[PDB]
């Protein structure tokens, strides 16, 4: 059948993107929202909106029953999952198909096969894709890992067969590390993913990350719409992405464009997807992954190749054959900058806060895809990404110049963002390059970039001079427009008011407990350091614990924070259970 009303099973920027694609296609659109999202732009932009209820992903966008109930009540006939949440859940894809809805995505079998890393390796080997030297099957023991590393040399990466989000890998530099690393890997892969399977391959030292956008129809046609380079990554998660992939030989570029098609055909893949690769310092390509979803980065391909990829997803899910018969020729160059709610001045840690101002850049070559606006609020419950800025030009140089403009115009206020990092890197020689290569690599931000972003403080008065009220006035001198900030106590000339009777200025105390010279009081309460969700409880009532022992893991902004015993004693009042939403200062337990 044909799509007529699409339910967008997601939130934020991707939900807006798909709602817009549906309006362009003339399709009706249904948004769904969790309670934290009751005012989100996508909720207001869709033709209909349904409240899932619940405060967290585990009780909203992850609940099959709720998303299928919203589809039934709205009378939607198709589901588009966006990315994350259920977009790569093969059992959700099957449940959507069983409900008689059009699943806008790859087949459940393709999702399952490409989501299994070792089945994916077998598919790529069958497709004769370029593979990094590595084990064809899960490794059984640290002794087998040592034997592999003795054969291939070092370093070696040991990787979980189902892992993701950058936690799926550890690397061994020296042979002796292998047993401890393998223990940690099998433990944590069981803990996080429910599966202990691990495999081992050559670790590439300073690789680039390169990926090919595929469009594949249900009739077996495949088009490679282009390439991205996504090497600017932090915690193995991408921050800046560009299209086409720069600084590749035509041999490399064609090998990518061909292996991606072979891999999709062997996988039986259809829909939008992406084949990820790594490129070594030697220039060797190596297959890395197939993502069975629309990519976050897709718009730099849209801007360079002239294809609307979400509408291509609608066409494929309608079962139409591709109207594009041949790989587009890129025009120009494009960058994407992810506007994460993360403070680059504190190691890119995310934090919630109010978006008190949001002024997107405009003008030539700028596209803004945002899930927030002035007056939005970022809670601790979902990923930190506010928006994406896409800047396009006739060349990589003209796209960098336009990016420097657009990022200078971009104003966000009320919470920290990575915009100061984007402002640096678009002006950093390591990323400008020499015209034939560049120095950035998938670990450059953490280990090479000269981080000079000052920590975010917002409007807080911190020094004694900050406490003085100020006025801003516009003065014109000789015609020059100046903006002049005048202290509310300026004793210039005959001026005064330096103190009304008894007025004292001193450095204000930070809104934090005690002095910074100590961590905590001797009190027995373990208290939550932040808002979040209790993702794991590591103790039980009556358990004896020692200082530093893990008590709970709190997930906030989809990052895990361990909360640990500050003293020795007995856990005497455990008040939380896994899945519980928790507020800063909540008592988790008393240690006695």
């Amino acid at each position: 059948s044909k799509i007529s009303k699409v339910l967008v099973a997601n939130r934020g920027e991707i939900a807006v993107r798909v709602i817009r694609a549906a309006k362009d296609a003339g399709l009706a659109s249904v948004a769904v929202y969790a309670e934290p999202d009751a005012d989100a732009p996508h909720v207001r932009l869709a033709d209909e909106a349904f409240a899932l209820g619940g405060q967290t992903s585990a009780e909203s966008y992850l609940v099959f029953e709720k998303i299928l109930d919203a589809a039934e009540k709205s009378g939607a006939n198709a589901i588009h999952p966006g990315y994350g949440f259920l977009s790569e859940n093969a059992d959700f894809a099957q449940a959507v198909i069983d409900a008689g809805l059009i699943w806008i995505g790859p087949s459940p079998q393709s999702i399952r096969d490409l989501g299994d890393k070792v089945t994916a390796r077998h598919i790529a080997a069958r497709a004769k894709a370029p593979l990094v030297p590595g084990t064809p099957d899960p490794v059984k023991d640290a002794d087998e890992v040592v034997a592999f590393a003795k054969e291939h040399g070092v370093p070696v990466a040991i990787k979980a067969a189902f892992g993701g989000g950058g936690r799926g890998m550890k690397v061994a530099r020296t042979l002796e590390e292998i047993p401890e690393l393998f223990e940690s890997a099998t433990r944590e892969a069981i803990a996080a993913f429910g599966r202990g399977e691990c495999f081992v391959e050559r670790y590439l030292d300073k690789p680039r990350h390169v990926e090919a956008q595929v469009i594949a129809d249900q009739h077996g046609n495949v088009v490679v719409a282009g390439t991205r380079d996504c090497s600017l990554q932090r915690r193995f998660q991408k921050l800046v992405e560009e299209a086409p992939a720069p600084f590749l030989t035509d041999a490399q570029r064609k090998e990518i464009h061909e292996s991606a098609k072979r891999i999709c055909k062997e996988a039986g893949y259809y829909g939008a997807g992406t084949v990820e690769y790594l490129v070594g310092q030697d220039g060797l390509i190596s297959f890395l992954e197939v993502n069975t979803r629309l990519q976050v980065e897709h718009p730099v391909t849209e801007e360079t190749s002239g294809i609307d990829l979400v509408r291509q997803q609608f066409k494929i899910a309608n079962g139409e054959p591709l109207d594009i018969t041949e790989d587009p020729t890129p025009r120009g160059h494009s960058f994407e900058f992810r506007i994460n709610g993360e403070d680059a001045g504190r190691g890119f840690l995310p934090a919630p806060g109010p978006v008190t101002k949001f002024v997107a850049p405009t003008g030539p070559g700028v596209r803004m895809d945002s899930g927030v606006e002035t007056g939005s609020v970022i809670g601790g419950q979902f990923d930190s990404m506010l928006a994406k800025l896409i800047v396009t030009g006739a060349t990589r140089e003209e796209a960098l110049e336009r990016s420097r403009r657009a990022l200078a115009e971009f104003t966000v206020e009320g919470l920290a963002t990575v915009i100061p990092f984007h402002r640096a890197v678009v002006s950093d020689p390591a990323f400008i390059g020499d015209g034939e290569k560049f120095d950035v690599h998938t670990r450059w931000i953490e280990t090479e970039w000269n981080n000079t972003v000052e920590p975010f403080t917002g409007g807080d008065p911190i020094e004694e001079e900050d406490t003085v009220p100020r006025q801003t006035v516009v003065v014109e001198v000789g015609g020059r427009r100046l903006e002049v900030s005048l202290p509310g106590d300026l004793a210039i000339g005959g001026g005064g008011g330096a103190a009304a009777p008894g007025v004292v200025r001193k450095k204000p105390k930070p809104r934090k407990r005690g002095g910074g010279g100590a961590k905590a009081a001797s009190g027995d309460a373990v208290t939550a350091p932040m808002q979040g969700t209790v993702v794991k409880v590591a103790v039980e009532e009556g358990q004896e614990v020692s200082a530093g022992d893990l008590v709970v893991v709190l997930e906030a902004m989809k990052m895990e924070n361990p909360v640990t015993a500050h003293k020795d004693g007995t856990i005497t009042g455990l008040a939380v259970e896994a899945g519980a939403a928790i507020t800063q200062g909540t008592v988790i337990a008393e240690i006695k």
């Binding site: 100020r470 100046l482 900030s485 005048l486 300026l490 004793a491 000339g493």
Partner: protein, 70 residues
């Protein structure tokens, strides 16, 4: 140094324009001058004109405090 300084938040004046600006602002700045003290003179103060009941608590919290506060 913890004085709150004048800040030119936008614009880059030439020294002649900085001098014109500062001279004009310094001429506008006026009034208090040095912190002279207003001399205390409680003669005929309003609180002394009020009728108070002989047992009025305002004899303590208004009248006496107004006389004693320094």
């Amino acid at each position: 140094d913890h004085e709150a300084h004048i800040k030119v938040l936008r614009g880059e004046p030439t020294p002649e324009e900085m001098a014109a600006l500062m001279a004009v602002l310094a001429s506008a700045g006026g009034g208090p001058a040095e912190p002279v003290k207003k001399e205390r003179n409680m003669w005929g103060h309003p609180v002394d004109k009020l009728r108070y009941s002989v047992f009025s608590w305002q004899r303590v919290t208004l009248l006496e405090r107004t006389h004693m506060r320094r």
